[PDB]
Amino acid sequence: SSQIRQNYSTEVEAAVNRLVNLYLRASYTYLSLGFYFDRDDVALEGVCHFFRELAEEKREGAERLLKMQNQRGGRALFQDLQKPSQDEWGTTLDAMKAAIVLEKSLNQALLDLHALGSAQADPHLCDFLESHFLDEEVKLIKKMGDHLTNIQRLVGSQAGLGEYLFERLTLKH
Amino acid sequence: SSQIRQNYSTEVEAAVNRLVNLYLRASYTYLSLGFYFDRDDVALEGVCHFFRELAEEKREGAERLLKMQNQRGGRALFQDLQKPSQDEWGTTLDAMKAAIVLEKSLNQALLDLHALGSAQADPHLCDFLESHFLDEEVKLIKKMGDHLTNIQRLVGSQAGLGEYLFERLTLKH
Amino acid sequence: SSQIRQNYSTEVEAAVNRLVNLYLRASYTYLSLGFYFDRDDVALEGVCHFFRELAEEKREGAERLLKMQNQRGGRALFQDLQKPSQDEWGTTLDAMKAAIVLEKSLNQALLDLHALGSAQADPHLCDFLESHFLDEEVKLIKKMGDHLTNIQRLVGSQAGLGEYLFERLTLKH
Amino acid sequence: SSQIRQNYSTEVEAAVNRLVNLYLRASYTYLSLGFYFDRDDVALEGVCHFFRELAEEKREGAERLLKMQNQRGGRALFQDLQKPSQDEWGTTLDAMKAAIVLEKSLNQALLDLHALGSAQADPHLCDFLESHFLDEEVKLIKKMGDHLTNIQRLVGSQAGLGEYLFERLTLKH
Ligand SMILES: [Au+]
Ligand SMILES: [Au+]
Ligand SMILES: [Au+]
Ligand SMILES: [Au+]
Ligand SMILES: [Au+]
Ligand SMILES: [Au+]
Ligand SMILES: [Au+]
Ligand SMILES: [Au+]
Ligand SMILES: [Cl-]
Ligand SMILES: [Cl-]
Ligand SMILES: [Cl-]
Ligand SMILES: [Cl-]
């Protein structure tokens, strides 16, 4: 074991590596979501940009986890990254629903890792998650819920119109 | 009685304290309106900001009344503040209707206080209301009436769409 | 329940609403304290400003709690706001003693809410309180204790003089 | 009568001339107060400056009244100006008490003139007083009441000390 490793359980080390895998999986999902909305037959630029920005954010979360793994003396271990759950993502509504599902799973993984840290008496892990992840996730899930509400209200009887208007007047382009 | 008190009736002093209570009540109503429109399942940011800004304005009106009470040698007396009339505020249309009702009640209270001042020959009170409150209220009620008209025109057959469009293109975000 | 709500107990949701009520109550107390020290027959400008600034700070705490309630998918519920415990606040010493009592009650409410969060395994709630409230309160209570000490030392045999000097040379005007 | 005079009673015209006399009398009182506090055996610079600034303010009030008299087509008529009520003004407390008495008499004269204007249906006179005099007077009398309170609290058992401290730490020099 590391010359620097102190109070860092094998259990947390392994759960960190698994979380890295989740975040990179999530990043890959968002890359696929982003490019789907760039297809000439979908063509919702603001939706594409919203998902591409999330791909970067999730990559950044993984890189923060990997940096922390090294700072504690754990050993990064990478696994295969499973492709995203879908090749085509339907409407903006369908996509935002899938994104909120994905975020809830990340959030629950964070909470599970926090509980493990608390059981292992690892306050540096708890702090790290509280400072860099738990609020970021709460804020993002709230944003998504606000978006889902506005998208749903816009469906009405003219779905196409509502999807265009949401892209143009809420999402950034 | 105060070493400074001059031409300031007990009646006006008491009516000032009651008006302070009304303004603070109104402020609290607007705080509740503002946060309702911030719920993930309402999510009309511009509507939230319109009501939150009014919460501040009504607080400011109360503070101006309290400052004036002290300048005339009256004694501020605070009472309990009743909660707002509703916990949920319905649509933007429902909310704007409730706001205009509330403003009309404030306006009538101002006018009643002006009439009392006139009956008591208290020109400083009359001036104070004319200068800091009566036009502010007339302008606000007109703005609200303009908003109600535009919201109502937007309901048509596609209410959800109309509510989104009003938030996006009239209200500020 | 919310589409966004995750790991957020009904118990915490309700305790958050109660804390909002406490903070708004505290804000109202400070508004009354502030205006009392603005009376022509009290006239301690720096004491008035100290309490008015606290009224704003406590309002801000309530608004942060309400924002957080919405971000977690809870539902803000407002109750009646009880008036402050006194109509007249005595000397600067009396007022600062009442303020420290009030702050200790807020602090204890925060700690009680933190313990509930810990019992419910809600690390986002714990973080939120630790980051935005617990140190703010500790720092404020320390400031108050420092003020009480200086005010008490100034009473001596010339109370009036001491109260003037504290207002002029410690409090800001 | 003037080619311009319209709705301007002889009664208001005469009461305006009398008010001019009062304001100039008040100005002269403040000049005497100011120079008394400049005596080598009084030597309270900040008290001198407070009263000298008021001498100017009251002169300015008279000049505004005279300008208004001309704008309405009335004819300024000057009378003898009686000297101030005292040659020596005692302590800062004595002086501030005399000043508040003087201001109350000016205020009552303003209110009496407003009532006359109202009885004569002269809204321009009412406006003029409301806009340029009634609030200025209320604010000044409040300032004076605040000063009297602080001076009185400072007397205690060490009057000399209290008078020095009030001059140094409240009044400007
Ligand atoms: Au923990
Ligand atoms: Au921990
Ligand atoms: Au009036
Ligand atoms: Au009046
Ligand atoms: Au905790
Ligand atoms: Au916790
Ligand atoms: Au009038
Ligand atoms: Au009039
Ligand atoms: Cl797969
Ligand atoms: Cl009620
Ligand atoms: Cl009560
Ligand atoms: Cl004489």
From Swiss-Prot, chains A, B, C, D:
It is found in: Cytoplasmic vesicle, Autophagosome; Cytoplasm; Autolysosome. The modification N-acetylserine is found at residue 1. Fe cation binds at residues 53, 56-57, 60, 63. Disulfide bonds: none annotated. It comes from the Eukaryota. The keyword Endoplasmic reticulum does not apply. One of its GO terms (molecular function) is ferric iron binding. One of its GO terms (cellular component) is autolysosome. GO terms for biological process: intracellular iron ion homeostasis; iron ion transport. Keywords: Acetylation, Cytoplasm, Cytoplasmic vesicle, Iron, Iron storage, Lysosome, Metal-binding. Its main location: cytoplasm. Gene3D superfamilies: 1.20.1260.10. PROSITE patterns: FERRITIN_1, FERRITIN_2, FERRITIN_LIKE. Residues 6-155 form the Ferritin-like diiron domain. Residues 53-60 are annotated as: Catalytic site for iron oxidation. Stores iron in a soluble, non-toxic, readily available form. Important for iron homeostasis. Iron is taken up in the ferrous form and deposited as ferric hydroxides after oxidation. Also plays a role in delivery of iron to cells. Mediates iron uptake in capsule cells of the developing kidney. Delivery to lysosomes by the cargo receptor NCOA4 for autophagic degradation and release or iron. Oligomer of 24 subunits. There are two types of subunits: L (light) chain and H (heavy) chain. The major chain can be light or heavy, depending on the species and tissue type. The functional molecule forms a roughly spherical shell with a diameter of 12 nm and contains a central cavity into which the insoluble mineral iron core is deposited. Interacts with NCOA4. Belongs to the ferritin family. In horse spleen the light chain is the major chain. This is Ferritin light chain. It comes from Equus caballus.
